[PDB]
């Protein structure tokens, strides 16, 4: 009966995790929003703005204390006292304005949540904003929780972006657990806090090109037949179920089209680069 309350916050994100969620099927996004979750705050799609939006977010975090999921899209920048990501402004009872940093927001909301779900490689692992050359002190949710000594149930759903099936599946499994924990145990997580349900399979071991790989039949260029290894494929070092699930309602996937770039992995992008050089 009751929908899962969700407060969805964005730090150093690109909105691509949200857009990928909008691509969900079985259920589609209309059913997700009307039947599965109560999306209480989401900066990209919600009706209210400014003071009203933030007041609503804080009201839900109070009324549904210990009973909402904090969804985090994007990394948390810690340099310059958090000022590389300002998420809003709060107007106190005297008229003065105060900016809220992503650090402050997460420190505030995470202890109020039932669980935090870091969707996307940025929030889960740091991802592109935390890659070499950045000067923002960009940090993952797990690292920020460790630094802050925040103990709150945390599940990572990585990918850049994650497949909507991974996000929907993980949230539904979490909510089912809360509603009946002994009938629905929490999904088993790997050492990087991501569900084995979606991230237990190695791409390469499950790849339809594996017969070609075994016969040393390698594509000389993108548009030639063969395994993609010499074009830079990171399938050998990447754990996700893309080979089975494919992308965009089964239309295509990275390896058929081009190469896997290892987007779900905690070392994406630096440990997966250069993308077009073999592993």
């Amino acid at each position: 009966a009751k929908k899962a309350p969700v407060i969805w916050v964005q730090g150093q994100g690109c909105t691509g995790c949200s857009v990928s969620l909008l691509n969900a099927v079985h259920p589609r996004i209309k059913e997700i929003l009307l039947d599965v979750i109560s999306l209480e705050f989401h900066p990209t799609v919600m009706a209210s703005e400014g003071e009203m939006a933030l007041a609503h977010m804080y009201e839900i975090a109070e009324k549904f204390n210990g009973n909402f999921f904090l969804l985090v899209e994007g990394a948390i920048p810690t340099a310059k006292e958090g000022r590389y990501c300002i998420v809003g402004e709060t107007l106190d009872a005297k008229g003065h304005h105060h900016e809220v940093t992503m650090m402050e927001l997460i420190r505030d909301l995470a202890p109020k949540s039932l669980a935090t779900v870091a969707v996307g490689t940025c929030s889960a692992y740091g991802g592109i904003p935390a890659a070499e050359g950045n000067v923002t002190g960009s940090k993952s949710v797990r690292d920020f929780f460790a630094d802050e000594k925040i103990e709150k149930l945390l599940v990572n759903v990585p990918g850049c972006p994650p497949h909507p099936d991974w996000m929907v599946g993980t949230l539904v499994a979490a909510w089912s657990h809360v509603l009946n924990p002994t009938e629905h145990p929490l999904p088993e997580l790997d050492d990087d806090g991501r569900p084995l349900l979606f991230f237990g399979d190695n791409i390469h071991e499950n790849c339809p090109y594996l017969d070609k790989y075994d016969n040393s039949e390698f594509a000389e260029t993108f548009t030639k037949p063969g395994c993609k290894a010499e074009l830079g494929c990171k399938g050998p070092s990447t754990y996700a179920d893309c080979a089975k699930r494919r992308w965009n309602n089964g239309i295509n996937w990275c390896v058929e089209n081009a190469v896997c770039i290892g987007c779900v992995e905690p070392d994406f992008p630096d440990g997966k680069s250069p993308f077009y050089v073999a592993e």
């Binding site: 691509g16 589609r28 996004i29 990275c254 089209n257």
Partner: peptide, 22 residues
């Protein structure tokens, strides 16, 4: 909501996936 999702099927057709084509 469904029409925009179908547009991303179209992008994925020759783009591999969407968001973030290959």
């Amino acid at each position: 909501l469904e029409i925009r999702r179908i547009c991303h099927e179209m992008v994925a057709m020759f783009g591999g996936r969407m968001p973030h084509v290959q």
